[PDB]
């Protein structure tokens, strides 16, 4: 019995589960709440899995077993040796990456050594710690263990690299704002703090050319990069504009959805940016228009909310080791 496991930011499991379920209908999906993991039982995984927009890494687990407390390292080594590893085919180097959750009398490096040396001996392929061609995964979680192979080399979230390195904001988080705001093809979308363009590009790539996409920032240099990135992926209909998010109506027309990732710092100055931005956002929506926004400062954000908005959803999401909130607001 085999399992595809997909990882995302903790807090986005329910959305990842929806994406997977549309790709692979059927029952038995498992979600690890607050851990960023979803698993689907699968007899086969092809290239279709690499089209996931909410996933960071994919692993195919070929075995799951109850770890025998008698000789747990021996049991893992025997489990690994009873599986097929055709990936070690043209690969010509590998490593084992082991992870543990719960208390165990062994460490992750012990698992890597015992499993890796058993595979090296059966397969002859050399271990390469820094640049492995294939990554074998062993995860021990409480009393169960999962063994298999990482399917992704680089994370799927490394799309749009010309817009990346800035900042902590991944295309996966951008896709989640899109979905939490219930944006659909044909809707007008604004990215009011666009930076090097990640949210705008994610939106354009997902919604296609029937959705007008507006994107603004004060930094002309970063707008130059965003335009370059849009062209490189065929997403040139995005309207990038030098624009102050404190005065959005000076620059943008009404839209249906606003996906907003305000800067972390410039606190009174921050409150004033939130104050002006949220009022501009309200003025650029119809009744029923929606904002999805990410913030490290939920109390301050809520203090700044104008009363024309209803707060419809809030959730916590892990990003770059810290925990911003996503709020969805609807204009009443």
mmCIF file of C-alpha atoms in Angstrom, residues 30-230:
data_model
loop_
_atom_site.group_PDB
_atom_site.id
_atom_site.type_symbol
_atom_site.label_atom_id
_atom_site.label_comp_id
_atom_site.label_asym_id
_atom_site.label_seq_id
_atom_site.Cartn_x
_atom_site.Cartn_y
_atom_site.Cartn_z
ATOM 1 C CA UNK A 30 -4.996 11.870 5.386
ATOM 2 C CA UNK A 31 -4.159 15.386 6.745
ATOM 3 C CA UNK A 32 -1.622 16.121 9.480
ATOM 4 C CA UNK A 33 -3.175 19.221 11.142
ATOM 5 C CA UNK A 34 -0.674 22.042 11.679
ATOM 6 C CA UNK A 35 2.160 20.009 10.083
ATOM 7 C CA UNK A 36 1.766 21.039 6.442
ATOM 8 C CA UNK A 37 1.335 17.448 5.122
ATOM 9 C CA UNK A 38 -1.368 15.629 3.153
ATOM 10 C CA UNK A 39 -1.186 11.954 2.044
ATOM 11 C CA UNK A 40 -3.287 10.210 -0.642
ATOM 12 C CA UNK A 41 -3.134 6.385 -1.119
ATOM 13 C CA UNK A 42 -1.977 5.795 -4.690
ATOM 14 C CA UNK A 43 -1.196 2.720 -6.842
ATOM 15 C CA UNK A 44 0.761 5.040 -9.204
ATOM 16 C CA UNK A 45 2.031 8.656 -9.321
ATOM 17 C CA UNK A 46 2.915 10.266 -12.679
ATOM 18 C CA UNK A 47 3.907 13.758 -13.867
ATOM 19 C CA UNK A 48 0.453 15.130 -13.111
ATOM 20 C CA UNK A 49 1.481 15.464 -9.448
ATOM 21 C CA UNK A 50 4.137 18.000 -10.452
ATOM 22 C CA UNK A 51 1.372 20.433 -11.536
ATOM 23 C CA UNK A 52 0.326 21.075 -7.909
ATOM 24 C CA UNK A 53 0.360 24.757 -7.039
ATOM 25 C CA UNK A 54 0.079 24.410 -3.256
ATOM 26 C CA UNK A 55 2.912 21.899 -2.776
ATOM 27 C CA UNK A 56 6.549 22.378 -1.863
ATOM 28 C CA UNK A 57 7.862 18.755 -2.016
ATOM 29 C CA UNK A 58 6.383 15.410 -3.070
ATOM 30 C CA UNK A 59 7.457 11.980 -1.635
ATOM 31 C CA UNK A 60 6.233 8.555 -2.749
ATOM 32 C CA UNK A 61 6.124 6.343 0.339
ATOM 33 C CA UNK A 62 6.277 2.717 -0.782
ATOM 34 C CA UNK A 63 5.921 1.248 2.706
ATOM 35 C CA UNK A 64 4.311 2.242 5.940
ATOM 36 C CA UNK A 65 4.822 0.069 8.979
ATOM 37 C CA UNK A 66 4.417 -0.213 12.691
ATOM 38 C CA UNK A 67 7.876 0.018 14.158
ATOM 39 C CA UNK A 68 8.893 -2.891 16.206
ATOM 40 C CA UNK A 69 10.404 -1.748 19.489
ATOM 41 C CA UNK A 70 12.504 -4.746 19.383
ATOM 42 C CA UNK A 71 15.377 -3.735 17.055
ATOM 43 C CA UNK A 72 13.785 -0.760 15.317
ATOM 44 C CA UNK A 73 16.895 -0.066 13.187
ATOM 45 C CA UNK A 74 16.982 -3.695 11.978
ATOM 46 C CA UNK A 75 13.290 -3.518 11.083
ATOM 47 C CA UNK A 76 13.813 -0.329 9.017
ATOM 48 C CA UNK A 77 16.781 -1.864 7.183
ATOM 49 C CA UNK A 78 14.708 -4.986 6.377
ATOM 50 C CA UNK A 79 11.735 -2.865 5.245
ATOM 51 C CA UNK A 80 13.989 -0.790 2.922
ATOM 52 C CA UNK A 81 15.560 -3.922 1.429
ATOM 53 C CA UNK A 82 12.120 -5.469 0.727
ATOM 54 C CA UNK A 83 11.124 -2.458 -1.493
ATOM 55 C CA UNK A 84 11.953 -1.690 -5.184
ATOM 56 C CA UNK A 85 14.180 1.378 -5.920
ATOM 57 C CA UNK A 86 14.160 1.798 -9.711
ATOM 58 C CA UNK A 87 15.085 5.547 -9.310
ATOM 59 C CA UNK A 88 18.582 4.504 -8.355
ATOM 60 C CA UNK A 89 18.603 3.649 -12.088
ATOM 61 C CA UNK A 90 20.343 6.329 -14.117
ATOM 62 C CA UNK A 91 20.860 8.319 -10.923
ATOM 63 C CA UNK A 92 24.406 7.355 -9.919
ATOM 64 C CA UNK A 93 24.378 8.946 -6.493
ATOM 65 C CA UNK A 94 21.964 9.094 -3.551
ATOM 66 C CA UNK A 95 21.521 9.894 0.108
ATOM 67 C CA UNK A 96 18.996 9.040 2.839
ATOM 68 C CA UNK A 97 17.184 11.898 4.615
ATOM 69 C CA UNK A 98 15.554 10.655 7.823
ATOM 70 C CA UNK A 99 13.190 12.644 10.050
ATOM 71 C CA UNK A 100 11.647 11.744 13.411
ATOM 72 C CA UNK A 101 8.642 12.881 15.396
ATOM 73 C CA UNK A 102 8.167 11.547 18.953
ATOM 74 C CA UNK A 103 10.643 9.907 21.328
ATOM 75 C CA UNK A 104 12.844 7.055 20.013
ATOM 76 C CA UNK A 105 16.006 5.362 21.321
ATOM 77 C CA UNK A 106 17.815 6.197 18.014
ATOM 78 C CA UNK A 107 18.661 9.415 16.094
ATOM 79 C CA UNK A 108 17.976 10.396 12.481
ATOM 80 C CA UNK A 109 21.657 10.106 11.474
ATOM 81 C CA UNK A 110 21.634 6.441 12.752
ATOM 82 C CA UNK A 111 18.676 5.667 10.469
ATOM 83 C CA UNK A 112 20.455 7.323 7.531
ATOM 84 C CA UNK A 113 23.582 5.292 8.087
ATOM 85 C CA UNK A 114 21.874 1.916 8.565
ATOM 86 C CA UNK A 115 19.432 2.367 5.624
ATOM 87 C CA UNK A 116 22.004 4.056 3.314
ATOM 88 C CA UNK A 117 24.708 1.438 3.845
ATOM 89 C CA UNK A 118 22.157 -1.352 3.201
ATOM 90 C CA UNK A 119 21.105 0.297 -0.067
ATOM 91 C CA UNK A 120 24.663 1.102 -1.127
ATOM 92 C CA UNK A 121 25.548 -2.549 -0.581
ATOM 93 C CA UNK A 122 22.512 -3.882 -2.562
ATOM 94 C CA UNK A 123 22.655 -1.251 -5.377
ATOM 95 C CA UNK A 124 26.320 -0.197 -5.630
ATOM 96 C CA UNK A 125 25.358 3.487 -6.135
ATOM 97 C CA UNK A 126 27.571 5.920 -4.134
ATOM 98 C CA UNK A 127 26.301 8.089 -1.299
ATOM 99 C CA UNK A 128 26.653 11.831 -2.032
ATOM 100 C CA UNK A 129 25.624 14.013 0.927
ATOM 101 C CA UNK A 130 25.769 17.456 -0.762
ATOM 102 C CA UNK A 131 24.625 16.752 -4.339
ATOM 103 C CA UNK A 132 22.619 13.478 -4.235
ATOM 104 C CA UNK A 133 20.913 12.626 -7.520
ATOM 105 C CA UNK A 134 18.053 10.854 -5.665
ATOM 106 C CA UNK A 135 16.885 11.371 -2.094
ATOM 107 C CA UNK A 136 15.632 8.353 -0.160
ATOM 108 C CA UNK A 137 13.207 9.387 2.616
ATOM 109 C CA UNK A 138 12.584 7.581 5.898
ATOM 110 C CA UNK A 139 10.209 9.343 8.307
ATOM 111 C CA UNK A 140 9.489 7.933 11.738
ATOM 112 C CA UNK A 141 6.368 9.398 13.338
ATOM 113 C CA UNK A 142 5.413 8.046 16.734
ATOM 114 C CA UNK A 143 5.079 4.291 16.303
ATOM 115 C CA UNK A 144 4.873 4.209 12.459
ATOM 116 C CA UNK A 145 7.531 4.549 9.793
ATOM 117 C CA UNK A 146 7.262 5.567 6.118
ATOM 118 C CA UNK A 147 9.930 4.712 3.512
ATOM 119 C CA UNK A 148 10.198 5.903 -0.088
ATOM 120 C CA UNK A 149 11.710 8.379 -2.516
ATOM 121 C CA UNK A 150 11.485 12.143 -2.930
ATOM 122 C CA UNK A 151 9.910 12.898 -6.335
ATOM 123 C CA UNK A 152 10.837 16.574 -6.489
ATOM 124 C CA UNK A 153 14.482 17.715 -6.756
ATOM 125 C CA UNK A 154 13.868 21.425 -6.334
ATOM 126 C CA UNK A 155 10.590 22.419 -4.608
ATOM 127 C CA UNK A 156 7.666 23.079 -6.980
ATOM 128 C CA UNK A 157 7.425 26.466 -5.385
ATOM 129 C CA UNK A 158 10.607 27.551 -7.235
ATOM 130 C CA UNK A 159 8.472 28.844 -10.115
ATOM 131 C CA UNK A 160 8.989 32.464 -11.244
ATOM 132 C CA UNK A 161 12.657 32.641 -10.064
ATOM 133 C CA UNK A 162 13.129 36.108 -11.629
ATOM 134 C CA UNK A 163 10.647 37.407 -9.036
ATOM 135 C CA UNK A 164 12.233 35.337 -6.185
ATOM 136 C CA UNK A 165 14.789 35.726 -3.389
ATOM 137 C CA UNK A 166 12.293 38.451 -2.492
ATOM 138 C CA UNK A 167 11.149 37.868 0.004
ATOM 139 C CA UNK A 168 9.888 35.204 2.330
ATOM 140 C CA UNK A 169 6.782 35.118 0.096
ATOM 141 C CA UNK A 170 6.481 31.923 -1.951
ATOM 142 C CA UNK A 171 4.281 31.281 -4.983
ATOM 143 C CA UNK A 172 2.525 28.672 -2.747
ATOM 144 C CA UNK A 173 1.429 31.396 -0.296
ATOM 145 C CA UNK A 174 0.368 33.594 -3.211
ATOM 146 C CA UNK A 175 -1.800 30.725 -4.640
ATOM 147 C CA UNK A 176 -3.347 30.291 -1.154
ATOM 148 C CA UNK A 177 -4.344 34.007 -0.998
ATOM 149 C CA UNK A 178 -5.926 33.589 -4.443
ATOM 150 C CA UNK A 179 -7.980 30.577 -3.272
ATOM 151 C CA UNK A 180 -8.894 32.028 0.143
ATOM 152 C CA UNK A 181 -10.211 35.157 -1.661
ATOM 153 C CA UNK A 182 -12.200 32.880 -3.994
ATOM 154 C CA UNK A 183 -10.734 34.544 -7.123
ATOM 155 C CA UNK A 184 -12.027 32.966 -10.396
ATOM 156 C CA UNK A 185 -11.214 33.452 -14.115
ATOM 157 C CA UNK A 186 -12.766 36.681 -15.434
ATOM 158 C CA UNK A 187 -12.413 38.596 -12.100
ATOM 159 C CA UNK A 188 -10.340 41.779 -11.806
ATOM 160 C CA UNK A 189 -7.485 41.318 -9.335
ATOM 161 C CA UNK A 190 -5.166 43.864 -7.671
ATOM 162 C CA UNK A 191 -1.747 43.148 -6.036
ATOM 163 C CA UNK A 192 -1.155 46.432 -4.138
ATOM 164 C CA UNK A 193 2.320 45.638 -2.669
ATOM 165 C CA UNK A 194 3.692 43.742 -5.585
ATOM 166 C CA UNK A 195 7.485 43.909 -4.997
ATOM 167 C CA UNK A 196 9.169 41.775 -7.672
ATOM 168 C CA UNK A 197 5.777 40.516 -8.778
ATOM 169 C CA UNK A 198 5.133 37.089 -7.151
ATOM 170 C CA UNK A 199 1.442 37.527 -6.297
ATOM 171 C CA UNK A 200 0.598 39.134 -9.687
ATOM 172 C CA UNK A 201 2.391 36.397 -11.644
ATOM 173 C CA UNK A 202 0.715 33.620 -9.605
ATOM 174 C CA UNK A 203 -2.681 35.225 -10.198
ATOM 175 C CA UNK A 204 -2.093 35.757 -13.985
ATOM 176 C CA UNK A 205 -0.712 32.249 -14.448
ATOM 177 C CA UNK A 206 -3.715 30.718 -12.604
ATOM 178 C CA UNK A 207 -6.635 32.868 -13.857
ATOM 179 C CA UNK A 208 -5.423 33.343 -17.491
ATOM 180 C CA UNK A 209 -5.889 36.396 -19.754
ATOM 181 C CA UNK A 210 -9.656 36.947 -19.188
ATOM 182 C CA UNK A 211 -8.793 38.331 -15.708
ATOM 183 C CA UNK A 212 -7.357 41.875 -15.682
ATOM 184 C CA UNK A 213 -4.416 41.927 -13.177
ATOM 185 C CA UNK A 214 -3.202 45.240 -11.693
ATOM 186 C CA UNK A 215 -0.062 45.401 -9.560
ATOM 187 C CA UNK A 216 1.574 48.306 -7.818
ATOM 188 C CA UNK A 217 4.714 49.250 -5.979
ATOM 189 C CA UNK A 218 6.860 52.294 -5.147
ATOM 190 C CA UNK A 219 10.210 50.685 -6.082
ATOM 191 C CA UNK A 220 10.860 51.121 -9.844
ATOM 192 C CA UNK A 221 13.750 48.646 -9.756
ATOM 193 C CA UNK A 222 11.550 45.873 -8.433
ATOM 194 C CA UNK A 223 8.881 46.755 -11.020
ATOM 195 C CA UNK A 224 11.579 46.295 -13.710
ATOM 196 C CA UNK A 225 12.204 42.764 -12.421
ATOM 197 C CA UNK A 226 8.488 42.003 -12.222
ATOM 198 C CA UNK A 227 7.990 43.048 -15.877
ATOM 199 C CA UNK A 228 10.944 40.888 -16.916
ATOM 200 C CA UNK A 229 9.501 37.905 -15.077
ATOM 201 C CA UNK A 230 6.035 38.443 -16.592
#
